[PDB]
Amino acid sequence: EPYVTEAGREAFDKLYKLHEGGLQILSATTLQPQLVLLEETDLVKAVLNVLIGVVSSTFSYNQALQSFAVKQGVYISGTSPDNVSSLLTQ
Amino acid sequence: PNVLLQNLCCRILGKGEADVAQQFQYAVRVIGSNFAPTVERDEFLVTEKIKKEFVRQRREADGALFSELHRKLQSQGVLKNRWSILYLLLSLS
Amino acid sequence: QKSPNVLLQNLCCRILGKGEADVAQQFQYAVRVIGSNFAPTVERDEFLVTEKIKKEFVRQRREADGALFSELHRKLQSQGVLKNRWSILYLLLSLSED
Amino acid sequence: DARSWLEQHIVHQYWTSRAPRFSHSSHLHSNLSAIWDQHLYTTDPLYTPDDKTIVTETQVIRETLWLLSGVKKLLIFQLNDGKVNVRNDIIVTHMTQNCLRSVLEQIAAYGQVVFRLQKFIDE
Amino acid sequence: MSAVRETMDVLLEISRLLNTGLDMETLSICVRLCEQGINPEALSSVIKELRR
Amino acid sequence: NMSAVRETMDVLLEISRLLNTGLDMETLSICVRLCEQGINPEALSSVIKELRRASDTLK
Amino acid sequence: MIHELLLALSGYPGSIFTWNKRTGLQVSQDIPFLHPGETSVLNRLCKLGTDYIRFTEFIEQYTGLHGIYLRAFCRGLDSILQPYRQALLDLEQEFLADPHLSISHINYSLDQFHLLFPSIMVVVEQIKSQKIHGCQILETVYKHSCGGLPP
Amino acid sequence: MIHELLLALSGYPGSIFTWNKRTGLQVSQDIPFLHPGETSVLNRLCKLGTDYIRFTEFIEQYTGLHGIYLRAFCRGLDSILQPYRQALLDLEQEFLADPHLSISHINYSLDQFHLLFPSIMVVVEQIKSQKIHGCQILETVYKHSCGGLPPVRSALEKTLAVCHGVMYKQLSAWMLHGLLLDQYEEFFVRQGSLKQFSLRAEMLPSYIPVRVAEKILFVGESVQMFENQNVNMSRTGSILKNQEDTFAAELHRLKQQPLFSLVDFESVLDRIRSTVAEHLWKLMVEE
Amino acid sequence: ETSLVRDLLYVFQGIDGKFVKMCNSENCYKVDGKVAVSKSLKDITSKLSELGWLHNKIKKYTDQRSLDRAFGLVGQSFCAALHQELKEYYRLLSVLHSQLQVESSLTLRRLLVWTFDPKIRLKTLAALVDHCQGRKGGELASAVHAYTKTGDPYMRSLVQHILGLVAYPILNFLYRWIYDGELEDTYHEFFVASDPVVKTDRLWHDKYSLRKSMIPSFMTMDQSRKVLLIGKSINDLENAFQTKIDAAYFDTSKYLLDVLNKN
Incomplete structure (x- = not known):
C-alpha cells in the first residue's frame, strides 16, 4: 500500500517543501526562500560543462577567486532536492 | 432492436452487411409477428427444465452445480428478465 | 442501551426527586459542568489514591473499617470488569461524609 | 496545499491521530467488529468500550514482515529486547479484537526469537 | 461496470454446461x-437458421 | 456474567456504605x-454536589 | 525518498539527512509522514554513511602524524569502499527504472557492508590513538586478518 | 461469524469462539443476532477445530516416553492436516466472491474432514494413555488402519510411510558397517569380539514376524564384527565393493510406497543376505 | 412467514427451530402456539418436517460410525457410504439458504419441489438402516442384496452406489486369499473364521468353513464352497463375482499340481 517510500521521489519533493517551510520562517528576512527550477536533464549536461572551463546556467564563473560557484540558494534538482546541491560542489 | 438483431446475424455468419441480407429478412419477419412473450412469466419453471435435463442425461453433479450458478446470476442484481435468458440457453442445449 | 446522555438523565431524575422531563433544566447545566475539564489532585499511581482512603478512615476514627476496605480492594482487582478502578475510588473518596 | 496532497497519496496515519479513518467495506462479513462491539455493549451491563487504534486492515501483515527480520518496532510495544508483544488496542474490522490478538501473538513470539538472535550479532 | x-462470467458458466456453443460475443x-422483451421461442428459432 | x-457491584457498595453515601444502589x-465510559473523577464529583444541594433547596 | 537516500550515503547532506559531528549522519526525529518503523531501518543505513565520511576524510587528510606507509594505508582503505560504491550505484539504476520501492530492498543489499565497516573502523582509530606509523602498519592490519569473520 | 470461524478452525481462537481448552465442548457462544438454529450448528463445526488443536499440541509435545518414532509419527501427522489447512484457505476466496455464503455452505465443504478427524483422535489417544514409543507406534497405526473407512485407510498408510522411512534409515545403517543409531533406544535391534546384540520381542511389530527379524540380525552382526577386526575383509566391502551404492539406491527406490508394500520390504532382506555373502563364505572355507 | 421459510431449513440439518418443539424423534413438528390459523401453511411445513425426521436416523448411525474402533470392518464402510449421500443432501440446503438472503422470500410451494428429489433418496436410505440393527459384516451385504431385486428404478440407482463400497471390503478379502492364501479378520466379519481346532501343516484338512449366518449373499451357496476350495489349495456387480472365481480355479490347480511334485 503507498507509503512515503512506495509513493515515490515526487512525494518526497512535496514533503521536502513542507519540512523546509518551518525552518524558512526564521531564515526569512521579511519573506521566505522560494524554489528554483532545474530539471534532471539540466544537471547531467552541466556536469560536463564545468570540466572544460565553461559556464552553463548553474555555474557562475567568479573572476575574484578563479573558482566556480553554484547557486547558493534552494534549487530543486528535479526530484532530488538539495542533496545534489552538495554533490554538485565536489 | 433493429441493430442488435442484425449484430446477431453478423457475428454468427461471420460476414458484414450485404452478405446477410436474406437471413436478416427471415429473422425480422419471425421475431416481429411474435414480439412479446407468449408464456406466463415465471423464473422457477425454466430452472426445473434445466435440472431435469441434467438428471435425464445422468449428469447429477452438474445438476447440483447449476443450482449454485443460478443463485450467483440472481444475486448480482443486474440482469432482470432472467427467465427469458435461461429459457434460451435451455432450448439450445 | 447505556449512552452517556441516557445515563446522566436517570441519575438527575432520582437525585433531584423530580420527573424525567422536569429535571431537564438542571440536566443541561450538568452537561456543561462535565464537559468543562478538571484534573484530579492525585494523577499518578493507583496506590497514591488507595492510601488516601486509608488515611481518611483513621481520621474519621474508624480504623477497623479501613482494614475491611483493604479486603474489598483484592476482590475488585480479581474480577476485572472495570479498567478504571481509580476513577471509581477517587469519586467515593470525594463524596465521603460523616 | 502540500499537506493535503501527501495525505491522499500515502495511506492515512495510524501511529498519530490527525488523519481520518476507514473501517468500511461493502461485504457483509467485513464490518464484523462494529456488530460484535454492539452486542457486547447491550448484553453486558458493565462493558468498557476501549479507546482503539483503528487499523488499516491487512497492513498488520506488513508489520509482521518487518518484525520477523529487520528492525525494532516502535509501532508496537516491546517491554524489552527479548519480549515482543502486541498492544491491546489493535483492531481489524473483519475480526474481533480478541480474535485478532491471537494471530498477532503467534508471530510476536516468533519475531521474539529473531530479534533476540539479532542482539547476539556483533558486527 | x-x-x-x-454477471457475464456466471452466464458463460451456464452456457458451458448446457453445450449451447455460444461465444462471449454471441451470448x-x-x-x-x-432484456428488451423478446419472446425466447422466436429467438431460438432464428439462431438455428443463422448457424446453418 | 450476571x-x-x-x-463487582457488591464490593463497591460495601465500600460506599462504610464511607457514608446518600446515593442508592441504582445511582451508584x-x-x-x-x-468505564471515560470522564475524569473531578467533574463527576462536582456535578453531584451541585445537584445534591439544589434538591434540598427545592424540598 | 529512496533515491535521495543514496546521496546521503555517498556523504552529501540534505537537511533531512543531517550530519552531526558527534553521533554522525542521522535521520531527523519524527518528520511528517515517516512511519515509526521506517525511521528505524533508515537509521541503520545512516551508520553506513557515518563511517563512510569518517573514512573519506581519512584519505584526504593524509594524501595530496606523518608517514609513507600511512598513505599506502590510505590506498589500502579505498579498496573496501570499492564494492560499497558499486552497490550504491546498482541501487541507483533500479530506482531510476520505477519509483515504487521499499527500503527493505536497500536493507537487504547493503547489509554485507554492515559487518565490514565496523570491523575496519576500529583499525583506523587504533592507528591514530597509539600514533603508529611505518612498517608496524603492516603488523597492525595483519593480526586482525587472523581474527574472525570471513568477509 | 464467517471470518472468526475460518481462523478458529486454523487454531487461532476468537472470543465469540471461546476455547475451553480440551475439557468439554462449548466452543462457540450463544449469539442473539443469528437464529437459534444457527448457534447449534456452529458448535458442530467447532468440534472439528477442537480435535484439530489436539493434534497441533501433540506435535510440540513430541518435538522437544518421547521416542524418535513418536516424533517421526508427528511429522507424519502434520501431512494429514495439509489438505485440511489447504481447504480452509480455498474457502477464503469463496466468501469474498459473494457475502451470500453462510455456515451451511461451510458444513458441506468441511465434511470430507468428519470422516478423518475423529478416527485419528483415537490414534493419538491410545498413544498418550499407554505412553507408547518405538516401532509400536507403527504397530498402533497399522492396527488402526485395520479398521474401515476409505479416507482413514488412505491417510494412515501415508502416516505409516513417513515413519517407516524412519525405520529405513535404521536398518540401512545397521547393515552397512554395523552402525547402531539409538538416541533414546527405540529400535528393535538391542545392544545390551563381535560385541552384544539381542532383539526385543516387546517392541516388535505384528507385520514383522519373528522369522523376518532374524534376517536383519545376522547380516548386521556380520558387518559389525569386521568393524572391530579389518574392513579389507569386509563382506559388504567399502574399498573393494560398490555394493553399498546398490544397496542405497535399492533403499531409496523403496523408501516410499503408495501405501505400504510388505513384499518389497522382505525382498531386499533376501538381497542383502546374498551377493555380498559370497565374500565371507570363502574366508571360513579356507579357514 | 419468511421466518418459517428459514425455519424449515434448519430442520433439514436436524437442528431444532426457533419455535418450541415437542417432536424430534416423532417427526419434527413445531407448535408455535398460534397453530390454528397456521393449519394450512403449517401443514405444508409439517410435510417437510418428516424429511428432517429421516435425516436424524442416518445421523445417529454416524455417531455409531467410529467409537474407540467400532465393531466390523464392513459395518463402518457401509456408514461411510451413508454419510456421502448425506453430504450431497446438505448441498441443496446450502443453495436454499443462500437464496433466502439475496436482494429473500422464496415460496413454500417452490421449495417443495426442491425437497421432493431428496424425499425419494433419503427415505430409502432410512429404509436400508431399518433392516440392519447389527453392524456385523455380510448382514449389510444381504441388505443391499435384498434391495437391488426390488422394483422402482430410482432407488435402484442409489443402492448401486452403495453396493460398490459395501462390497469393496468383501472383494479385498477375496482376492488376497485366492492368490497368495492370506486372510484378514478383525471381528470374524469375513465368512471364514480360523482355528476350528488348531493349525496343522497343509495337505488339505478341515481348517476353513463357510460360516453361514454372516455369509454375503452376493455369492450363491455352491460358489462360496468353490472359493473355499480355491483358498485351501493355494495355502449388477453381484454377478461379476461368480465369473472370475471360475478363472481363479484353473490358476490355483497348477499350484495344487506343484504340491504332488514335493511329495
Whole structure:
C-alpha cells in the first residue's frame, strides 16, 4: 500500500517543501526562500560543462577567486532536492 | 432492436452487411409477428427444465452445480428478465 | 442501551426527586459542568489514591473499617470488569461524609 | 496545499491521530467488529468500550514482515529486547479484537526469537 | 461496470454446461435481445437458421 | 456474567456504605458506567454536589 | 525518498539527512509522514554513511602524524569502499527504472557492508590513538586478518 | 461469524469462539443476532477445530516416553492436516466472491474432514494413555488402519510411510558397517569380539514376524564384527565393493510406497543376505 | 412467514427451530402456539418436517460410525457410504439458504419441489438402516442384496452406489486369499473364521468353513464352497463375482499340481 517510500521521489519533493517551510520562517528576512527550477536533464549536461572551463546556467564563473560557484540558494534538482546541491560542489 | 438483431446475424455468419441480407429478412419477419412473450412469466419453471435435463442425461453433479450458478446470476442484481435468458440457453442445449 | 446522555438523565431524575422531563433544566447545566475539564489532585499511581482512603478512615476514627476496605480492594482487582478502578475510588473518596 | 496532497497519496496515519479513518467495506462479513462491539455493549451491563487504534486492515501483515527480520518496532510495544508483544488496542474490522490478538501473538513470539538472535550479532 | 463483468462470467458458466456453443460475443448479444422483451421461442428459432 | 457484575457491584457498595453515601444502589451503578465510559473523577464529583444541594433547596 | 537516500550515503547532506559531528549522519526525529518503523531501518543505513565520511576524510587528510606507509594505508582503505560504491550505484539504476520501492530492498543489499565497516573502523582509530606509523602498519592490519569473520 | 470461524478452525481462537481448552465442548457462544438454529450448528463445526488443536499440541509435545518414532509419527501427522489447512484457505476466496455464503455452505465443504478427524483422535489417544514409543507406534497405526473407512485407510498408510522411512534409515545403517543409531533406544535391534546384540520381542511389530527379524540380525552382526577386526575383509566391502551404492539406491527406490508394500520390504532382506555373502563364505572355507 | 421459510431449513440439518418443539424423534413438528390459523401453511411445513425426521436416523448411525474402533470392518464402510449421500443432501440446503438472503422470500410451494428429489433418496436410505440393527459384516451385504431385486428404478440407482463400497471390503478379502492364501479378520466379519481346532501343516484338512449366518449373499451357496476350495489349495456387480472365481480355479490347480511334485 503507498507509503512515503512506495509513493515515490515526487512525494518526497512535496514533503521536502513542507519540512523546509518551518525552518524558512526564521531564515526569512521579511519573506521566505522560494524554489528554483532545474530539471534532471539540466544537471547531467552541466556536469560536463564545468570540466572544460565553461559556464552553463548553474555555474557562475567568479573572476575574484578563479573558482566556480553554484547557486547558493534552494534549487530543486528535479526530484532530488538539495542533496545534489552538495554533490554538485565536489 | 433493429441493430442488435442484425449484430446477431453478423457475428454468427461471420460476414458484414450485404452478405446477410436474406437471413436478416427471415429473422425480422419471425421475431416481429411474435414480439412479446407468449408464456406466463415465471423464473422457477425454466430452472426445473434445466435440472431435469441434467438428471435425464445422468449428469447429477452438474445438476447440483447449476443450482449454485443460478443463485450467483440472481444475486448480482443486474440482469432482470432472467427467465427469458435461461429459457434460451435451455432450448439450445 | 447505556449512552452517556441516557445515563446522566436517570441519575438527575432520582437525585433531584423530580420527573424525567422536569429535571431537564438542571440536566443541561450538568452537561456543561462535565464537559468543562478538571484534573484530579492525585494523577499518578493507583496506590497514591488507595492510601488516601486509608488515611481518611483513621481520621474519621474508624480504623477497623479501613482494614475491611483493604479486603474489598483484592476482590475488585480479581474480577476485572472495570479498567478504571481509580476513577471509581477517587469519586467515593470525594463524596465521603460523616 | 502540500499537506493535503501527501495525505491522499500515502495511506492515512495510524501511529498519530490527525488523519481520518476507514473501517468500511461493502461485504457483509467485513464490518464484523462494529456488530460484535454492539452486542457486547447491550448484553453486558458493565462493558468498557476501549479507546482503539483503528487499523488499516491487512497492513498488520506488513508489520509482521518487518518484525520477523529487520528492525525494532516502535509501532508496537516491546517491554524489552527479548519480549515482543502486541498492544491491546489493535483492531481489524473483519475480526474481533480478541480474535485478532491471537494471530498477532503467534508471530510476536516468533519475531521474539529473531530479534533476540539479532542482539547476539556483533558486527 | 464490475458487477456487469461478474454477471457475464456466471452466464458463460451456464452456457458451458448446457453445450449451447455460444461465444462471449454471441451470448452478450443474446442477453441484450432478451432484456428488451423478446419472446425466447422466436429467438431460438432464428439462431438455428443463422448457424446453418 | 450476571453473577460476576453483581459481585463487582457488591464490593463497591460495601465500600460506599462504610464511607457514608446518600446515593442508592441504582445511582451508584450509573456512576461506574460513566467511569468505564471515560470522564475524569473531578467533574463527576462536582456535578453531584451541585445537584445534591439544589434538591434540598427545592424540598 | 529512496533515491535521495543514496546521496546521503555517498556523504552529501540534505537537511533531512543531517550530519552531526558527534553521533554522525542521522535521520531527523519524527518528520511528517515517516512511519515509526521506517525511521528505524533508515537509521541503520545512516551508520553506513557515518563511517563512510569518517573514512573519506581519512584519505584526504593524509594524501595530496606523518608517514609513507600511512598513505599506502590510505590506498589500502579505498579498496573496501570499492564494492560499497558499486552497490550504491546498482541501487541507483533500479530506482531510476520505477519509483515504487521499499527500503527493505536497500536493507537487504547493503547489509554485507554492515559487518565490514565496523570491523575496519576500529583499525583506523587504533592507528591514530597509539600514533603508529611505518612498517608496524603492516603488523597492525595483519593480526586482525587472523581474527574472525570471513568477509 | 464467517471470518472468526475460518481462523478458529486454523487454531487461532476468537472470543465469540471461546476455547475451553480440551475439557468439554462449548466452543462457540450463544449469539442473539443469528437464529437459534444457527448457534447449534456452529458448535458442530467447532468440534472439528477442537480435535484439530489436539493434534497441533501433540506435535510440540513430541518435538522437544518421547521416542524418535513418536516424533517421526508427528511429522507424519502434520501431512494429514495439509489438505485440511489447504481447504480452509480455498474457502477464503469463496466468501469474498459473494457475502451470500453462510455456515451451511461451510458444513458441506468441511465434511470430507468428519470422516478423518475423529478416527485419528483415537490414534493419538491410545498413544498418550499407554505412553507408547518405538516401532509400536507403527504397530498402533497399522492396527488402526485395520479398521474401515476409505479416507482413514488412505491417510494412515501415508502416516505409516513417513515413519517407516524412519525405520529405513535404521536398518540401512545397521547393515552397512554395523552402525547402531539409538538416541533414546527405540529400535528393535538391542545392544545390551563381535560385541552384544539381542532383539526385543516387546517392541516388535505384528507385520514383522519373528522369522523376518532374524534376517536383519545376522547380516548386521556380520558387518559389525569386521568393524572391530579389518574392513579389507569386509563382506559388504567399502574399498573393494560398490555394493553399498546398490544397496542405497535399492533403499531409496523403496523408501516410499503408495501405501505400504510388505513384499518389497522382505525382498531386499533376501538381497542383502546374498551377493555380498559370497565374500565371507570363502574366508571360513579356507579357514 | 419468511421466518418459517428459514425455519424449515434448519430442520433439514436436524437442528431444532426457533419455535418450541415437542417432536424430534416423532417427526419434527413445531407448535408455535398460534397453530390454528397456521393449519394450512403449517401443514405444508409439517410435510417437510418428516424429511428432517429421516435425516436424524442416518445421523445417529454416524455417531455409531467410529467409537474407540467400532465393531466390523464392513459395518463402518457401509456408514461411510451413508454419510456421502448425506453430504450431497446438505448441498441443496446450502443453495436454499443462500437464496433466502439475496436482494429473500422464496415460496413454500417452490421449495417443495426442491425437497421432493431428496424425499425419494433419503427415505430409502432410512429404509436400508431399518433392516440392519447389527453392524456385523455380510448382514449389510444381504441388505443391499435384498434391495437391488426390488422394483422402482430410482432407488435402484442409489443402492448401486452403495453396493460398490459395501462390497469393496468383501472383494479385498477375496482376492488376497485366492492368490497368495492370506486372510484378514478383525471381528470374524469375513465368512471364514480360523482355528476350528488348531493349525496343522497343509495337505488339505478341515481348517476353513463357510460360516453361514454372516455369509454375503452376493455369492450363491455352491460358489462360496468353490472359493473355499480355491483358498485351501493355494495355502449388477453381484454377478461379476461368480465369473472370475471360475478363472481363479484353473490358476490355483497348477499350484495344487506343484504340491504332488514335493511329495
